[PDB]
Every structure is written in C-alpha cells, then in structure tokens.
C-alpha cells in the first residue's frame, strides 16, 4: 500500500471552504504514480483514469488519508485504485470515504517506450 | 464553450520535463467547473470523472489549450467533456490532442442541496 | 484573441478576500505571453508593461475571464492589451471590466536576440 | 505512525536539482502536525523544532517517504520525530535516510489555550 | 525602504530557465503593497501600475533583491517605485538592475472607501 | 543583514487563519540560504537547523519581517540566526518577535564537496 496524509488548508480549498476537486485528483494521481513506480521499479506515466467518484465533501481543516493499491497488472500497464478518507480528530466522529478512483499507469524505458512490469501477487 | 490557455513551465512538470498528469486533471476539472457554473448559474461541485485518456505527452514549454463543452444535462447534473490540445509555435508545426476526459458536475443551493439546472440548448 | 478563465479560490486572494493584485498581473502577463507567442511563432519575452488599471475588486468565488489582443506590431516587438472581466453567475447580474493593461513582448532567436515578427492584420 | 510519500518534481527543488531544504522542513512539520493531531484529538500548533539534520541530498525524481512518530508526551505538549527516506526505484538499488528532525507540538482548546493530551501508550 | 530577497528556483522560472515575468510583477506589487501599508498604517490596494521595464533576464539560481521606495503621496494614494537587482554570488562578479516599475496604491477604510494617508516625509 | 518582508495571505495559512509553521520554516531557511550565499560567495546547502521557537501566532493579514544574521563561521560551515517579526500597521500597536531559529549552512564546490568560507568580521 501507498499512503499519504494531508491537513486541508485554505490554499487547497475552493470558495466553499472544501477541498477543491482538482486538488483531490492531483493527489490521487500522485499516489497512483508512487504505487506504480514502486511496483514497476522504473519510470511510469499516467495514461488513463476512470470512475472517480466524489462522494462526500472534505471540509477546511480536515485530515485526509490517501491509500493507493495495485489492483491488476497487464504487460506494461498497471491499474491502481485510490481512496481518500477523511479522519475525524474529535472523539466520537468516525472516518468516512470521501472519494475513490482508478488509474492506469504505464512503465516506460529510457526511450519512453512501454516496458514490461513484474506480475502482481 | 469554455477555454483556457497555459504556457507549460517547470513548476507544472514532472521530473521527465512533461506536464504532470495531476496538473492536467486539476486544469480539466477547473475548466469543467467554469463551464458547468456558467450553464447552471449556481454553485456547482464535481461528483464524478471518467474516461480520462492521456494520449500524448506535453513537453516543457508547450502552449496548451483546454476546451470544455457541455455534452448533456440531467436534472441537477451536467456532463462536461474537456479536451487539452497542444498548440505548436513553430511555423507549419503540428497541433494535436494530448488528453480528453469527461466530468459530471452538480448544481447545489446555498444549503448544499442539488438544484435543477436549465435544459441543454 | 487569447482567452483564459479562472474561478477565484482562497489561494489566489489577499487577506481582504479579493483577488490579489500581484496575481492578476501574473495572469495578464501569461495571457500576453501566449498571444504574443501565437503571433510571432517563436520564443518571446516580456520587456515592458504600462497603464495597468485595477478598476474594481474581484471577490472570492468570482469567475474571471482574461482576454488578450495584439494591438500593434513594430519589428521584433508586439503590444498586447489584456482585459480581465468578472462574469457573474447569478441571473440578473452582468459582467464588468475589473482590470486592463498593456504589455510589450519581444520575439527572440535561439541566441536570445530580438527577432522579427510577422506584421499584424 | 504517520506516513506521507512524495515524488520529487522540479517545483520543489532548488537550482541544484535537489529537494529544497525549506520544502523538507515544511513537509516534516506537516507530518508532525498530523501525527500530533491524531494523538491529541484536538487542534494542535507547532511550538518548537530542533535537531533537524540534512544528511544526504534528495535528487530530482526521487521518491521520498516521511515517517512521523510520537516520541514523548508531557501535559499539553508532544514531541514527534520525523524521518525522511528516499526510496530508490531501480532494482536492488539503495534506500537511505536523507533527513531527520524533532518537533514539539501543543494541543489547544477552541480558545487557543494549551489543553492536556492523552498519555503515551 | 522595503526590501525582499529571493533565491531564483525552478518553480519561478519560465521554460527558458529565467525568472518568469509574471512572477516579477507579483513580487514587485507585493513589495509596493508592504511599503504602502507601512506608510499609510491602513489597509491598502493597488489601483495602478505603470512603466515596468524588464531590462535584463534573471537566470535560474540568481539571488534577487527587491527594493520599494515611496516616491510621492497625494491624498489617499501613494506612488511606490520598485527595483529588482540581481546580486551575483561569484567574487568580484557583477550586480545589476534587472527590472523597475511604479505602482500606485490607495489606502481604504474598513468600509473599503479611500482614506487619507500621512504626508511624504 | 538579510531581510525579507511578506504580507500574510490565505494561501500561506493553516485552517486556524494563522501563518502555517511549515511555511515560516521554509521562509527562514530561504533567508538563511541567502545570507550564507552572500558570505560564502559560492553555492551552499542547509545541513542543520536547531532551536526553532514559535513564540506567538501570526494572524492572517499581518506583515512579517524576516531578518537573517551570520552568527559564527567554522571552516566550510556557517551558523545563521533568523528572526521573524510581525510589524503591526495600525497606530498604537508595536512589533513583536513571532519566531526565531538557527540554521547551519555549508558552502560546497562544483563537485558538491564542502568548501572553505571567508571568516566573519
Ligand atoms: C503512455 C503512452 C506512451 C502509451 O502509448 P500507446 O501507443 O497506447 O502504447 P501501447 O499501445 O503499447 O500501450 C501500452 C499499454 O498502455 C495501455 N493503454 C494505452 N492507452 C490506454 C488507455 N487510454 N486506457 C487504458 N490503458 C491504455 C495498453 O493497454 C498497454 O497496456 P499493456 O501493455 O498492459 O497491454 C502514450 O499514451 C503517452 O505517451 N501518453 C501520455 C502520458 C502522459 O503524458 N501522462 C501525463 C504525465 S504523467
Ligand atoms: C452529490 C452530493 C452533493 C450529494 O448528492 P447525492 O446523494 O450523491 O446525489 P443525488 O442523488 O442527490 O443526485 C444528484 C445528481 O448527481 C448525480 N450523481 C451523484 N453521484 C454521481 C456519480 N458518482 N456519478 C455520476 N453522477 C452522479 C445524480 O445522478 C444526480 O443527477 P441528476 O439530478 O441529473 O439526476 C455528494 O455526492 C457530494 O457532496 N459530493 C462531494 C462533492 C465534492 O466535494 N467535490 C469536490 C469539490 S468541488
Ligand atoms: C552538506 C554535506 C555534503 C556535508 O557532509 P559531511 O560528510 O558532513 O561533510 P563534512 O563532514 O566535511 O562537514 C562539512 C561541514 O558541515 C558541518 N556539519 C555537517 N553535518 C552537520 C550537522 N548535522 N550539524 C551541524 N554541522 C554539520 C561540519 O561540522 C563541517 O563544518 P566545518 O567545515 O566548519 O568544520 C551533507 O551533509 C549533505 O549533502 N547533506 C544534504 C544537504 C541538503 O540536501 N540540504 C537540503 C537542500 S538545501
Ligand atoms: C504555546 C503558546 C500557544 C502559548 O503557550 P506558552 O506560554 O508559550 O507555553 P505554556 O507555558 O502554555 O506551555 C505549553 C506547553 O508547550 C511547551 N512549550 C512552550 N514553549 C516551548 C518551546 N519553545 N520549546 C518546547 N516546548 C515548549 C511547554 O513546555 C508546555 O508543555 P507541557 O504542557 O507538556 O508541559 C505559544 O507559544 C504560541 O501560540 N506559539 C505560536 C504557535 C504557532 O503559531 N505555530 C506555527 C503555526 S502551526
Ligand atoms: C528583451 C531584451 C533582449 C531587449 O533588449 P534591447 O537591447 O532593448 O533590444 P533592442 O534595443 O533591439 O529592442 C528590441 C525591441 O524591444 C523594444 N523595447 C526594448 N526595451 C523596451 C522597453 N522598455 N519598452 C518598450 N519596448 C522596448 C524595442 O523598441 C524593440 O522593438 P522593435 O524591434 O519593434 O523596434 C532585453 O530588454 C531583455 O532581455 N530583457 C529581459 C526580458 C525578461 O527577462 N523578461 C521577463 C521574463 S519573460
Ligand atoms: C480606487 C477604488 C477603490 C475606488 O475609487 P476610485 O473611484 O477608483 O478612485 P477615487 O476617485 O476614489 O480616488 C482614489 C485615489 O486613487 C487614485 N486613482 C484611482 N484610479 C487610479 C488610476 N487608475 N491610476 C492612478 N491613480 C488612480 C485617485 O487619483 C485618488 O488619489 P488621491 O486621493 O491621492 O487624489 C477602485 O479603483 C478599486 O476598488 N479598485 C480595485 C482595487 C483592487 O482590487 N486591486 C487589486 C487587489 S490588491
């Protein structure tokens, strides 16, 4: 698993005071990029993203955790699922899934051509 | 038809010298956010993204243009397609589609509740 | 014409909750940079800026549109006028000019020396 | 155990092509802020930082991982140690500690007054 | 006499490896904003900018210093001149003016109405 | 002395509306980096930071001044003390020290090896 936690500050929000969607997309892609690089052990690029759902808003000041997991491997491509959870700090409240999405990354050689990646296990 | 043009500087690239995918996603979402806002004439939020394909890399120093177009409207939701073209500077040089994706946005009232939007004209 | 639209988020504002002036200047220059590159079909640099007027404040959450237009051409230099309009979203309200300014850009060769640009039409 | 992983892109480097020290410090503080927040279950602020050592440089394109661990607890204060490791991509390649530092954070009430935190378990 | 010094890193450059003009403009405005604020002892806004000349390029890795000086005062307005010098590191190396511009700022009350400022001493 | 002034905008704050600690650390390091480069007259890197104390919060909209001063010199290393003062604008209020810290920088040759710096005076 690949994890990244972020406090949500004003600079990452929209005018409503919630985490901007473009920002969550960038963080998820970064997370997928890291998980894919770890598996392929070489340079990778994002080629596709699908089914990204923004289920619940992320308020200013929330702590969110991104978790990326390799779901399947083809030959040079990898599909990574990324989830974003907001973890409440005040006792009582519980963590909830704010967003989730899938990304397909491709490993490439120094020439930039698709390169084979190890199978998953 | 919403349009945004950006010069690609070092700050928006990955370590390969090409436009980082996360930045591409954020710019597209922002494009769709503006297009949806103008059609709904209300506050809008991104609820879904799908079929985002990164066909060709965008080199450092490229001039990129994002074009967002409203494709369909439901009741409170709108599907916007966003394309990203790199517009070569050199005379007679190319001009190609680098990426494209779809986003679904929902208009909401001041209470944050989904609100209906005008029909697709 | 060269156009760019931006939603105004907290990260681009000053402590008053309005678009920071330094940010509008950077966006206008970027717009002029793009319009000039498109005309010259080569690398350009900003050499001068004049008469930038900030007529009305741009509130947090506003949608602004930047429009850059080539106004005159010398030999290697180009003068581009940039306007920034805020486009209200709520029915009733109308668009207003928030700021406007002029920029002079110069095309340069690979050696960094001023290079001739096509005349305007 | 709080963890954050980041790819090192041009935007976070100094003119040498290595991760800028100021960015390292900001990421560590952010790591400690999250770890302290989760333990205190309250709003927290950084009051002190010490013994931050930059042992090895982090090259552009490296994958870095920050790990924050609560080391000791007083009454309202917590000392968190943060380490930053670069995780090589190449097969059989290295894996080293690039930096480490300690931060002291204090939990505060909504009034901004220091509040006690749970004991160290 | 307001002063700000900045190291020029990749994140603030254009694709040529020199300090981006938009960033220069934002830094100058910020310099003038601070100088005007200290003289007016009130909230201030930028209303006009003129005669900004980019005389020499600022290479990646340069140390730049901005100096803002109050030149004249009207009733509620102030004209501040901002200069940007690159301070070479190498022994006996140069030291030159890279850019200069003028900004006009206006002090305003909490209502946002122009307020008078002290005379120029 | 090396000085840098900054207005505190939303983008540099935490969710409490005060200057984020990670940001003050980055600004102090930048300040130390500049002061050290000026003394060594060559490339430098941050190797150590100690005793950074955050004494008082810095509110949104405050003007802060960073002052870096070379305190001692070894052979290739330099210790710089950095202070951050907030300078009130409204008559009556006075400036106060918000934070202070020490940094050790090392000059290096083109090969990246520690290089001797002139003694202090
Ligand atoms: C990545 C790239 C080189 C692939 O080009 P290509 O001609 O499709 O290469 P191939 O046809 O050999 O396909 C390579 C792999 O990617 C997969 N793939 C390519 N396009 C895809 C798409 N849009 N959706 C899903 N998978 C895709 C293929 O299925 C194949 O997987 P496999 O080897 O497991 O079978 C090209 O699409 C590209 O350069 N895109 C831009 C990448 C980028 O700039 N990203 C943003 C910056 S991080
Ligand atoms: C939509 C939301 C506000 C609550 O409503 P909901 O119960 O999820 O959805 P509703 O049943 O109210 O339906 C709202 C509309 O969105 C559509 N919708 C909701 N979830 C969707 C998804 N994952 N994919 C596609 N469309 C979706 C519905 O089909 C409906 O469209 P319609 O009115 O045209 O028929 C909630 O998803 C939300 O707050 N999400 C977070 C948004 C956000 O923070 N985004 C990033 C910040 S910009
Ligand atoms: C800077 C670096 C090359 C020094 O390595 P080194 O093996 O310690 O080198 P040396 O042992 O010759 O020490 C060089 C000097 O640094 C000082 N120094 C080294 N480590 C130190 C530490 N953690 N605390 C204080 N001073 C330290 C030494 O005392 C010596 O000073 P002196 O010449 O005045 O006596 C190495 O630590 C490094 O590359 N660190 C990463 C720097 C970086 O990436 N910073 C962030 C980006 S700006
Ligand atoms: C702590 C603060 C809130 C006021 O309290 P204070 O009078 O300084 O400290 P207190 O006497 O109330 O003690 C609070 C705790 O912090 C600790 N502390 C305070 N100053 C410290 C320092 N410089 N080094 C180490 N610990 C320190 C105390 O030991 C005490 O710990 P304990 O309860 O476990 O025994 C004040 O320092 C503050 O507001 N600082 C600015 C914080 C900030 O803006 N940081 C950056 C933004 S995230
Ligand atoms: C652009 C630059 C090379 C021009 O230098 P120069 O010695 O003035 O070159 P020239 O005298 O040949 O003038 C070139 C053109 O620029 C115009 N120009 C130069 N300085 C100007 C100024 N301050 N105001 C308006 N136009 C100006 C000239 O009129 C001429 O236009 P023309 O060919 O249509 O007649 C030099 O000023 C420079 O490098 N500046 C820094 C650019 C930069 O870093 N910008 C920020 C980063 S994008
Ligand atoms: C100034 C403003 C507040 C409304 O006042 P106004 O009607 O434009 O100007 P006023 O007639 O009230 O005069 C105010 C002062 O500004 C000066 N001024 C206004 N427009 C100016 C311009 N374009 N050029 C030079 N000075 C100008 C006036 O000469 C006067 O100076 P004085 O009192 O010393 O004689 C309005 O221009 C404003 O809100 N602009 C937007 C500011 C902003 O958002 N900037 C970017 C964010 S920091």
From TrEMBL, chains A, B, C, D, E, F:
Protein name in UniProt: HotDog ACOT-type domain-containing protein
PROSITE patterns: HOTDOG_ACOT
GO molecular function: long-chain fatty acyl-CoA hydrolase activity
Hydrolase recorded as keyword: yes
Keyword Hydrolase found: yes
Gene3D superfamilies in the record: Hotdog Thioesterase
GO biological process entries: acyl-CoA metabolic process; fatty acid catabolic process
This protein's GO CC annotations: cytosol
List of residues binding CoA: 21, 46, 53-55, 75-77
Annotated family: Belongs to the acyl coenzyme A hydrolase family.
Residue ranges constituting the HotDog ACOT-type domain according to the UniProt record: 1-111
Key words, A-Z: Hydrolase, Plasmid
Matching InterPro entries: Cytosol_ACT, HOTDOG_ACOT, HotDog_dom_sf, Thioestr_dom
SUPFAM superfamilies per record: Thioesterase/thiol ester dehydrase-isomerase
